[PDB]
Amino acid sequence: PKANLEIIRSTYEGSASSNAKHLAEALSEKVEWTEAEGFPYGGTYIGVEAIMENVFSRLGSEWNDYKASVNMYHEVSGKDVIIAEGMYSGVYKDTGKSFEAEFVHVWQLENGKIVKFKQYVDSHLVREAMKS
Amino acid sequence: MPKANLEIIRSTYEGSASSNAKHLAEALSEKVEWTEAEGFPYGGTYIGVEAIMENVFSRLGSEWNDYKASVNMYHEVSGKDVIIAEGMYSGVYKDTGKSFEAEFVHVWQLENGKIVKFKQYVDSHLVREAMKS
Ligand code: NA
Ligand code: NA
Numbered sequence: 001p002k003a004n005l006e007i008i009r010s011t012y013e014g015s016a017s018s019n020a021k022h023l024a025e026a027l028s029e030k031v032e033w034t035e036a037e038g039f040p041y042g043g044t045y046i047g048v049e050a051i052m053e054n055v056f057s058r059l060g061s062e063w064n065d066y067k068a069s070v071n072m073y074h075e076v077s078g079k080d081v082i083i084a085e086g087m088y089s090g091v092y093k094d095t096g097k098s099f100e101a102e103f104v105h106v107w108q109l110e111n112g113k114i115v116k117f118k119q120y121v122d123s124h125l126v127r128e129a130m131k132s
Numbered sequence: 133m134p135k136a137n138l139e140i141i142r143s144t145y146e147g148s149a150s151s152n153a154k155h156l157a158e159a160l161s162e163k164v165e166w167t168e169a170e171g172f173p174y175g176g177t178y179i180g181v182e183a184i185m186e187n188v189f190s191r192l193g194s195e196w197n198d199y200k201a202s203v204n205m206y207h208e209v210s211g212k213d214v215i216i217a218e219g220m221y222s223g224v225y226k227d228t229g230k231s232f233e234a235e236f237v238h239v240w241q242l243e244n245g246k247i248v249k250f251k252q253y254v255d256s257h258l259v260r261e262a263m264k265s
Contacts, residue, residue, distance in 0.1 A: 039257075
């Protein structure tokens with residue numbers, strides 16, 4: 001099997017299509033996916049179909065060029081956990097305002113499947129781009 | 133020999149505010165660079181303890197009641213002098229009387245037992261909402 005670090009990098013480091021396919025291939029059936037409360041898509045979603053409807057489809061439809069760029073990956077001692085420090089950027093369609101916001105994503109894997117994801121994000125900056 | 137990284141970082145959260153502060157001051161390197169998230173009210177990068185206290189901790193103390201950072205997971209990065217803490221802030225903003233809760237991650241880097249870098253990630257919208265009249 002591919003290393004966990006490689007699996008996680010594969011959800012960010014390629015084209016949008018390769019990233020999306022890689023993520024879907026790696027998600028466990030009952031993956032628990034948490035967007036930060038202050039982020040517009042905040043909440044916890046169980047399974048790929050809820051994640052697509054409530055999160056990724058909206059990142060595509062409400063923003064132009066929504067992008068997540070990782071600056072560091074960290075492998076956690078004594079866990080199957082990968083922590084990514086990164087930056088988001090994008091333009092909110094309704095306002096035309098661009099933003100940048102720093103994030104951390106905490107990924108947990110079991111037997112090489114992604115079983116948990118949690119977003120931490122500088123949500124004030126995201127929300128400011130949404131303000132007319 | 134210095135104490136373990138994990139021990140040092142835990143000692144900055146797991147006591148009362150007064151001992152946490154003592155422990156942090158004792159562990160900060162002279163060259164520490166400390167970054168608060170841009171969208172957090174005290175956003176910026178601060179060099180050295182004096183700047184950190186002036187711009188960050190003094191204001192957490194003076195502008196809020198019972199500002200607290202509660203850690204839910206401590207992580208140590210394999211083969212690196214990096215500790216990552218996941219947790220929750222809580223507090224009441226004095227000027228509005230509003231309470232908040234917000235999720236954070238803190239990324240700490242050390243060199244030979246002294247903290248050389250800190251970086252805050254925080255759900256800043258929720259903090260900012262408590263500050264609105
Ligand atoms: Na590990
Ligand atoms: Na106070």
